[PDB]
Homo-oligomer: A and B are copies of this chain.
Amino acid sequence: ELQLRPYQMEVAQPALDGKNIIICLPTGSGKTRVAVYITKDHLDKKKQASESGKVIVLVNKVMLAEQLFRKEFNPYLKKWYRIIGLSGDTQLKISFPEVVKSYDVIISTAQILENSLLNLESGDDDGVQLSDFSLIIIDECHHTNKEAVYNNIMRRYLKQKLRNNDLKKQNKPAIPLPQILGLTASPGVGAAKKQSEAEKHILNICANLDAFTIKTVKENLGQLKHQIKEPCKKFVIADDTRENPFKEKLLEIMASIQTYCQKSPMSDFGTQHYEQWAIQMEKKAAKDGNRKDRVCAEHLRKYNEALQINDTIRMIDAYSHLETFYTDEKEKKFAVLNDETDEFLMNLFFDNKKMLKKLAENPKEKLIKLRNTILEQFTRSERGIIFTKTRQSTYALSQWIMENAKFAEVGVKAHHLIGAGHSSEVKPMTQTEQKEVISKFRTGEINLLIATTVAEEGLDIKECNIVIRYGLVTNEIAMVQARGRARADESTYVLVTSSGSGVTEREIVNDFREKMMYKAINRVQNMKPEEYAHKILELQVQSILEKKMKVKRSIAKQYNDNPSLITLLCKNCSMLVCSGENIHVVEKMHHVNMTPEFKGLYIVRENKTNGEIICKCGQAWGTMMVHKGLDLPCLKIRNFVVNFKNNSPKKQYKKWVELPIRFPDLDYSEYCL
């Protein structure tokens, strides 16, 4: 039942017989089916050759593993050969090393294979080796970067290949190397100004993957052009001339606070430079142990945030954010009670809270023209996607769609999607919820999906009529991927952003980067085999050598590991909180203090299933981890300061591993009875 198209067979012909290559075709070009056919043919050849046929497939995202196992690989190849799909969400309850030699076909995330190989090197597990495989297939090869995971596996393979090459001249016996196939659409450019540098980057990618070709379609290119229709470009610009009253009032309170705390800004208000200066002042206050510096800096950062989102988000969201932050602060202080500067800030906000609320309520936007374009397009159509910067922006957009009655009149369905993980005050989503949202959009129940960069990569959809980016541009690879994600016969590509910012210049930069992409692929494809191979060998040895010395330097970097040489103090108040030995380590990951003498210092607080800790000052410290029954008080070094026993050089790390000195584990015999 397997089917092929003339361009598919043309591109895949070299790979049918050896030729460990890369295939760079646009999105929705059957690349998945090309890989499926190549796998089927390779396994058929292995069976005909009376040789073991092992195929492994690597995908950076967890979801794409299930997607391939469900839609392309298993349905077409279920009957002939055994198939299994592995992932972090999936419980590989059997093992990796033997399932390698059980099902003859593996689809797994790269990190699992990497972990298995590291375990083998450590010797704890029997482990697996690349020799066990006969064919390695990689999706989204552009991620093979300086030391990405794909790059780690490929560096191991390339060290093996270099050893094999050395033996070729030294000794006949050699370790077999599986064939390598890579699939991508935009290999990418490492921000290279010179087309020489662009082709250098392309050759670096090839060397990392040992591609020895790109093998792009040239004959049936007209057929592809007919098949795939590029979306129509559209540029939208805006100016934040309005918002004067409330913005001016907010700036006035900013200036009042700044003069109260005499902060020479050393930058213009409303920029990342100002936030960096504020954080540097945070650090300086930590090294000096004074107040009046960190609280005001954090408040200014929050107001700057509010302003930046306001340029792209409605005020109500910013005001709610600020109100929640101040509510949390007030609850902290109220719990602690049970200075004139914190009082100044809080009482200033309380006194002006009503007037600020009324002032934000008044009129005086990108939002009005965004609504105009969206509804005009929807009537002109009788799917849509929004790409933005931060998750709260997606939530605000969803709220705007729901509340506004015009969208209800149109009846467009919408839902907010965001990435997983905890990212500094954005709620972590769950993978199952992401799969649910994607499936709901696929079945047509959701007509408008708002997503962050997550949807840019993978997250394939059969068609997406409308792709409207909203103030998001990062690089050419993301731009091209998002553009190709439309896959609709009649697509509409729109970019919305402020004219003052450099975002339009960035979009045209990405356009030229795409053009330079092709300008470099066509060049590299036409190169002398001898000089070409010399370049690949050079780049391969470069990568291997760099990795070797990187490992050496990492070994040489972390060596001190002293038992106890410091005193840990509260950052807000320079008081002796803990010694260099009273701390204990559990699970080899978490830190705790068990002596009750500490319990007389900190204050437990719980308002919400794990409580938290706070200082006498109100500074948050950590949580109460319920492990093995024990409610161990875990503390985050992110909210503490260190004082070495000698010279008292105060240092703040935000992180434990950055501290070279180690702490002892918790001996449960100590807490006997």
Contact = CB atoms under 8 A, between A and B. Distances in A.
Interface of A: 84, 92-95, 98, 102, 124-125, 191, 193-196, 266-268, 436, 439, 505-506, 508-509, 512-513, 541-542, 545-546, 549-550, 553, 628-630, 668-669, 671-672
Give 6 nearest A-B pairs by CB, closest first.
A93-B509, A549-B629, A94-B512, A94-B509, A546-B629, A94-B508
A292 to B, nearest CB: 22
Candidate in A92, A545, A546 with the most chain B CB atoms within 10 angstroms: A545
B94 A195 contact: no
B668 A541 contact: yes
Contacts of A436: 266-267
Given A509-B94, A549-B630, A629-B553, A194 B124 contact: yes
Given A98-B512, A546-B628, 12 more contacts: A84-B505, A93-B191, A93-B506, A93-B509, A93-B512, A267-B436, A541-B672, A542-B628, A545-B668, A546-B629, A550-B629, A553-B629
Contacts of A506: 93
A666 B375 CA distance: 62
Copies in the complex: 2
Nearest to A124: B196
Contacts of A196: 124
Contacts of A553: 629
A92 B508 CA distance: 11
B191 A669 contact: no
A94 B502 CA distance: 13
A195 B508 CA distance: 54
B125 A195 contact: yes
B95 A512 contact: yes
Contacts of A195: 125
A660 to B, nearest CB: 18
20 contacts: A84-B505, A92-B193, A93-B512, A94-B505, A94-B509, A94-B512, A95-B512, A102-B508, A124-B194, A125-B194, A266-B436, A267-B436, A268-B439, A541-B672, A542-B628, A545-B671, A546-B628, A546-B629, A550-B629, A553-B629
Nearest to A98: B512
Contacts of A630: 549
Contacts of A267: 436
Contacts of A629: 546, 549-550, 553
A181 to B, nearest CB: 26
A672 B193 CA distance: 31
A413 to B, nearest CB: 12
Contacts of A268: 439
A233 B505 CA distance: 49
A668 B669 CA distance: 55
Contacts of A508: 94, 102
Nearest to A433: B266
Contacts of A546: 628-629
Contacts of A439: 268
A437 to B, nearest CB: 11
A117 to B, nearest CB: 16
